[PDB]
Amino acid sequence: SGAIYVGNYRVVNRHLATHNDWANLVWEDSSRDLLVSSTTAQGCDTIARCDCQTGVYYCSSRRKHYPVSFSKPSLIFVEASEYYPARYQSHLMLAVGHSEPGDCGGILRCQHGVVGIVSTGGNGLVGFADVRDLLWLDEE
């Protein structure tokens, strides 16, 4: 689990969105595994606006933050799960790192701010849904 709290937005994995998220919906995209809802309180995270390919992510199944090198956002085939059929997910970045299904939502960050959240993994890989292109997260 986990979310990004930037301005009056809450960014979560679409597959982990709550009823309150759907009832306060701003934007969702199943091909990216992302959903954004509105919040009453202002958040403290800032979004990275950069070209970094190195950063650090939070892994809940280890209670640890790990440094990683990750690929540029791309269209990648993701195997069938209990949340989606086997399909292509867009804006996904891969790295070598430990992950388990409940690690989704952990933040990936670089020196400029939040880059994305854990969205996929398996066999020593971890995938992150990029948010750096969502410029509207920085405005009301």
Ligand X SMILES: COc1ccccc1CC(=O)N1CCN[C@H](C(N)=O)C1
- Footprint on this chain of ligand X (rule: CB under 6 A): 15, 33, 78, 81, 83-84, 89, 99-101, 103-104, 118-122
Dihedral sign, CA of 136, 132, 77, 106? Answer: negative
Binding residues for Zn(2+): 50, 52, 110, 112
Q: Is 104 a catalytic residue?
A: yes
Question: With binding defined as CB under 5 A, does residue 117 bind Zn ion?
Answer: no
Q: Which one of 21, 33, 103, 130 is the catalytic residue? A: 33
Q: Return the one option of ligand X, Zn ion, none that residue 120 interacts with (CB less than 5 to 8 A, by type).
A: ligand X
Contacts (Cβ under 8 Å, ≥6 apart) of 58: 2, 64, 65, 106, 107, 118
SS3 (DSSP) at 67 = strand
Q: Smaller CB distance to ligand X: residue 5 or 84? A: 84
